Design an enzyme around this catalytic site. Sequence first.
Site, PDB file in Angstrom:
ATOM      1  N   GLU A   3      -0.032   3.836 -10.327  1.00  0.00           N
ATOM      2  CA  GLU A   3       0.864   3.914  -9.176  1.00  0.00           C
ATOM      3  C   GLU A   3       1.223   5.344  -8.604  1.00  0.00           C
ATOM      4  O   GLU A   3       1.662   5.452  -7.450  1.00  0.00           O
ATOM      5  CB  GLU A   3       2.159   3.139  -9.540  1.00  0.00           C
ATOM      6  CG  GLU A   3       1.886   1.625  -9.638  1.00  0.00           C
ATOM      7  CD  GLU A   3       1.700   0.986  -8.301  1.00  0.00           C
ATOM      8  OE1 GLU A   3       1.555   1.593  -7.235  1.00  0.00           O
ATOM      9  OE2 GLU A   3       1.771  -0.298  -8.384  1.00  0.00           O
ATOM     10  N   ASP A  20       2.348   2.093   1.193  1.00  0.00           N
ATOM     11  CA  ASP A  20       1.372   1.743   0.183  1.00  0.00           C
ATOM     12  C   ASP A  20       0.064   1.340   0.865  1.00  0.00           C
ATOM     13  O   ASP A  20      -0.032   1.512   2.052  1.00  0.00           O
ATOM     14  CB  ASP A  20       1.939   0.721  -0.840  1.00  0.00           C
ATOM     15  CG  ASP A  20       1.944  -0.665  -0.282  1.00  0.00           C
ATOM     16  OD1 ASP A  20       1.871  -0.851   0.936  1.00  0.00           O
ATOM     17  OD2 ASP A  20       1.923  -1.632  -1.174  1.00  0.00           O
TER      18      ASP A  20
END
Length: 163
Positions: free
Chosen positions: A11, A20
């Site tokens: 991540e 994202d």
Amino acid sequence: MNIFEMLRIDEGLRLKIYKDTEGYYTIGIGHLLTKSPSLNAAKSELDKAIGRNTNGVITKDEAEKLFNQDVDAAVRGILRNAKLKPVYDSLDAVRRAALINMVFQMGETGVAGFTNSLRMLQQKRWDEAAVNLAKSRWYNAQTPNRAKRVITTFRTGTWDAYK
């Protein structure tokens, strides 16, 4: 290596509001703020999470507390899922860590929907399971390289994909 390093690795970490792969507001270590197109909404969502006026930015420690909370909920989501739990119970320690990785990434509901793969994991057919896992939007389009890492973990039961 453990689930924390693992997701920390998959991540990253960002102290400022970001978008994202699917253009969603996220922050820290994969903390999804809001599917909502509004940066405002993302801000209000954030200030709420943190319990302060962020202006859209947080501290490292602040990233880290959201992360603990998030790894925790994942795990708990799994344990509450009828569908997920028994898979989880059957897996070794490394392999659960991948299961948890996918839950953190696409929810319990998203995950509980890979029925097929789930049985194949359950039944310990690693190679078949990897192949099946691979036929996904996840793998195919979404997040190829991370999916390969997670995919490989499930196969080998090693962290080899991680070093």
